[PDB]
Design a protein around this ligand. Structure first.
Ligand SMILES: Nc1ncnc2c1ncn2[C@@H]1O[C@H](COS(=O)(=O)NC(=O)[C@@H](N)Cc2ccc(O)cc2)[C@@H](O)[C@H]1O
Ligand SMILES: Nc1ncnc2c1ncn2[C@@H]1O[C@H](COS(=O)(=O)NC(=O)[C@@H](N)Cc2ccc(O)cc2)[C@@H](O)[C@H]1O
Lengths: 317, 324
């Protein structure tokens, strides 16, 4: 099964709520799944790709997926997993990054659709920007509508917010309110698109939790979250990281990690990865696993043209 | 000095910061030193379509400041009442409809201007008074988008100071807990202060003792952001009798005061009226000799009824009282 396969690959790390309450994810798995991306930079990087890949897998299986650009949330800054408060970002810069992210996400989905077809009937891929609905949201109207549905006790206790909340210098009201906006986003997408699932890296669990808890509080509806593992400077935009550098980053992965990366970053069937690995024991010199990993990812973010310059450049050298 | 006098009456129970400021509150109020006149505001939330006797004490505080030559603003919380102030309570108020709050706010603006009118026409004292203005915070919040607000001032409000307010610490402990909207309420009141300070040069906020925390959040936010000094003043909390004639008649209002117990009448005379303290003392001495006359109570009832309902209201009140 889809969930089963991704869990097996290691791409889907966990499913929530654990209780699953009324139902439980395996059961509803055309669903709509979304994942947000905050434009703190004018380019996505290799880590964000893992979350995007999670969406692609669901789309390939027939589900509709939404890649949300956080044009409004990036103005505040996600405190999840952070020790220090973020340097304030100019609104103008945030909107410029947002426009760039939207184009970046569409270019990736374009490469996906054109170079990784499998003849299956895929769901849709849509890029939205939360600033679309926040620019119409007035302060007090928002607080009067949904403010009573959030409990300070729950907000203050999220694990994701403890690093900043419990710091010696304290967290700002903006940092604290961030999770409310992400929770609202989930609720908004649930109401306008039937979105019942939100995917993100494990550092996003808290924000996702407040979202499904929020929605289950207003409606006895059940919605879920899926996290992807966090893998630990390599950008997806050619003007910051050329195809050659992106390719080299993957091609130089250690033998001990190369197999996990093939599972996480490519669409290659598990049985084929087994083959590439067994073939490797027999021919360490060819660096087959690494060459295959680099090719798949580079083709995904920079197309054939990019893959070609990438290989030709490495070969020449 | 204005502050000493009102402290003497028991009306201004507290004011702060006490020291550690370029110029202290007393000198800021002083006609001769530093600036003059100052601008002071007090917020009133239209959770009902009428003010009541408790709100009157806060209003009286403004009146006293206005009589000393300062400008006073009576703020109707058309936006804040949509949420509800959690201060001094353990129960989560059940919010009213936007439409209802809008109508209440309009009635309040009218009730406040009516009291101000009675004050200026019936309680002149020969001095040159400052102005009295009514504003509604919905005027600026209706132009505030959620994210623009959080981005603009969200970084200057610190969860630490916000979580520390006793009122807030009280609700977070209660078995019922606390909603996000009740928590955010103090941010709006704090912002209101900053906004009036910036636009009108308002440096003082007045409120009942339950407003201490909310006024403090204003002080912190303003100081943090501008390095400027602002102040708060609180009046005593007193123990529903409405100020709106069609909800509570002049006679009924009059009654609430005249039926007051001797053990409390003198305090009410000091808090609710403009009578000089020496006169209030004399009144209490005549009463100890002729308790039956209920002089203090009648004096108190007449003063307030006249301020709330004018001479016409007091006459009607007296007609009914005589009849009985
Ligand atoms: N190194 C990494 N490994 C794996 N996943 C990673 C990663 N670095 C980032 N990610 C994932 O990719 C996304 C991270 O990008 S982010 O722009 O840092 N994510 C965020 O800030 C989200 N709060 C954005 C958001 C989400 C939902 C909303 O409704 C609104 C905004 C998250 O899903 C994050 O978990
Ligand atoms: N029983 C009572 N005795 C003495 N004073 C009383 C009282 N009942 C109310 N008051 C005072 O008169 C006002 C009470 O009215 S209230 O509508 O309940 N006040 C509030 O809720 C404020 N938070 C309104 C507010 C204040 C400032 C703003 O910028 C915005 C709104 C406060 O100053 C309160 O302390």
């Amino acid at each position: 099964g889809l969930l089963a396969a991704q869990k097996a690959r290691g791409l889907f790390k966990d499913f929530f709520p654990e209780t699953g309450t009324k139902i439980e994810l395996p059961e509803l798995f055309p669903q709509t799944i979304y994942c947000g991306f905050d434009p703190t930079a004018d380019s996505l990087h290799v880590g964000h790709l893992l979350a995007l890949l999670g969406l692609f897998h669901l789309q390939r299986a027939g589900h509709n997926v939404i890649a949300l650009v956080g044009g409004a949330t990036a103005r505040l800054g996600d405190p999840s997993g952070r020790t220090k408060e973020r340097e304030a970002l100019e609104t103008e810069r945030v909107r410029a990054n947002a426009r760039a992210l939207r184009l970046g996400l569409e270019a990736l989905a374009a490469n996906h659709q054109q170079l990784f077809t499998d003849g299956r009937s895929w769901g849709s891929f849509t890029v939205l920007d939360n600033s679309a609905w926040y620019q119409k949201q007035h302060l007090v109207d928002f607080l009067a509508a949904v403010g009573g549905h959030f409990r300070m006790g729950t907000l203050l206790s999220r694990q994701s917010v403890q690093l900043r909340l419990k710091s010696p210098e304290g967290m700002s009201l903006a940092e604290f309110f961030y999770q409310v906006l992400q929770a609202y986003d989930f609720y908004y997408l649930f109401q306008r698109y039937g979105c019942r699932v939100q995917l993100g890296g494990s550092d996003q669990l808290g924000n996702i939790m407040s979202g499904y808890e929020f929605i289950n509080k207003l409606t006895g509806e059940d919605v879920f979250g899926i996290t992807v593992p966090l893998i630990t400077a390599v950008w997806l935009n050619r003007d910051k990281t050329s195809p050659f550098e992106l390719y080299q980053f993957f091609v130089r992965q250690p033998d001990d990690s190369v197999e996990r990366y093939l599972k996480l970053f490519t669409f290659l069937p598990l049985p084929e990865i087994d083959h590439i690995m067994q073939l490797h024991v027999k021919e360490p010199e060819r660096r087959g696993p690494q060459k295959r990993l680099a090719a798949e990812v580079t083709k995904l973010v920079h197309g054939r043209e990019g893959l070609d310059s990438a290989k030709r450049c490495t070969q020449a050298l």
